Amino acid sequence: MQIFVKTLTGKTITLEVEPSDTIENVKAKIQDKEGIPPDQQRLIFAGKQLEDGRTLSDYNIQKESTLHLVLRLRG
Amino acid sequence: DFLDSLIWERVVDEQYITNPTFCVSDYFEVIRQPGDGNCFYHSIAELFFDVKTPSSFRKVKEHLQLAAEVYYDTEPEAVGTGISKDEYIKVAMKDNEWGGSLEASMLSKHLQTTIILWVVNSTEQVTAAIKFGPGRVSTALNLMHVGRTHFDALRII
């Protein structure tokens, strides 16, 4: 199952993922592909930030959905 | 106005994003902040008060403490950590401690202004922005995120 992830600079990432995968799970897959550390990722969909505990189906994320990736900005 | 022509995507709780590309010097004048570890706050102090002193940042850090007291528990960015409100304040309030988006969010609610963080290139080009609060950019406090580690101040020309 391919999902879409849109970053702050408007850059999209395609990701193979299974509905049972946790949010920690998906963040870990983002680190693999794009070198973004999980602790620095904010995963936002439908108007709410996802939480590590829940799976993809607990926010009803399915098939061609596009989640937002917001970097935790510190400096 | 160009800056006000930019459309913003709300993504959570009055937090908006946008991904243009332009040169900061065209629309903004840059007021540089020292490499303190307090530059985030200094940046606020430069835009929020008439006269900015080197010790003003502590007034915005004072506000943060007051703001965290009542907003931390409902902040989206904070939620995605597992850090308690108390665990957070005994580190954020320590000297030379970095800040950014979390504190931008909290403060925008507290001082009732809207705060924007403009992510910039080594080519001094903006590529992304986060707005905290429903304001237009002109009447908003504009900050520039320079490395991936520094904040300076911006005034519209």
UniProtKB/Swiss-Prot annotation, chain A:
It is a peripheral membrane protein. Exists either covalently attached to another protein, or free (unanchored). When covalently bound, it is conjugated to target proteins via an isopeptide bond either as a monomer (monoubiquitin), a polymer linked via different Lys residues of the ubiquitin (polyubiquitin chains) or a linear polymer linked via the initiator Met of the ubiquitin (linear polyubiquitin chains). Changing residue 72 to G: No effect on ADP-ribosylation. The record marks 54, 72 as: Interacts with activating enzyme. Changing residue 74 to K: No effect on ADP-ribosylation. Changing residue 72 to K: No effect on ADP-ribosylation. Changing residue 44 to D: Impairs ubiquitination by CRL2(KLHDC3) E3 ligase complex. Impairs ubiquitination by CRL2(KLHDC3) E3 ligase complex. Phosphorylated at Ser-65 by PINK1 during mitophagy. Phosphorylated ubiquitin specifically binds and activates parkin (PRKN), triggering mitophagy. Phosphorylation does not affect E1-mediated E2 charging of ubiquitin but affects discharging of E2 enzymes to form polyubiquitin chains. It also affects deubiquitination by deubiquitinase enzymes such as USP30. There is a cross-link at residues 6, 11, 27, 29, 33, 48, 63 (Glycyl lysine isopeptide (Lys-Gly) (interchain with G-Cter in ubiquitin)). The modification (Microbial infection) ADP-ribosylthreonine is found at residue 66. The chain holds residues 1 to 75 of 685 of the full protein. It is found in: Cytoplasm; Nucleus; Mitochondrion outer membrane. This is Ubiquitin. The record marks 68 as: Essential for function. It comes from Homo sapiens (Human). The modification Phosphoserine is found at residue 65. Residues 1-75 form the Ubiquitin-like domain. Changing residue 66 to A: Abolishes CteC-catalyzed ADP-ribosylation. Signal peptide: none annotated.
UniProtKB/Swiss-Prot annotation, chain B:
It comes from Dugbe virus (isolate ArD44313) (DUGV). Interacts (via N-terminus) with host ISG15 (via C-terminus); the deISGylase activity of the viral protein interferes with antiviral signaling pathways mediated by NF-kappaB and IRF signalings. Interacts with host ubiquitin. It comes from the Viruses. The active site is at 39 (for ubiquitin thioesterase activity), 150 (for ubiquitin thioesterase activity), 152 (for ubiquitin thioesterase activity). The viral OTU domain (vOTU) and its N-terminal extension is responsible for ubiquitin and ISG15 binding and for the deubiquitination and deISGylation activities. Classified as His(+) endonuclease since it has a histidine upstream of the active site that coordinates the first cation. Residues 1-27 are annotated as: Essential for the vOTU enzymatic activity. Belongs to the Bunyavirales RNA polymerase family. This is RNA-directed RNA polymerase L. Displays RNA-directed RNA polymerase, deubiquitinating and deISGylase activities. RNA-dependent RNA polymerase is responsible for replication and transcription of the viral RNA genome. During transcription, synthesizes subgenomic RNAs and assures their capping by a cap-snatching mechanism, which involves the endonuclease activity cleaving the host capped pre-mRNAs. These short capped RNAs are then used as primers for viral transcription. The lineage of its organism: Viruses, Riboviria, Orthornavirae, Negarnaviricota, Polyploviricotina. Changing residue 100 to S: More than 90% loss of deISGylation and debubiquitination activities. Residues 28-157 form the OTU domain.
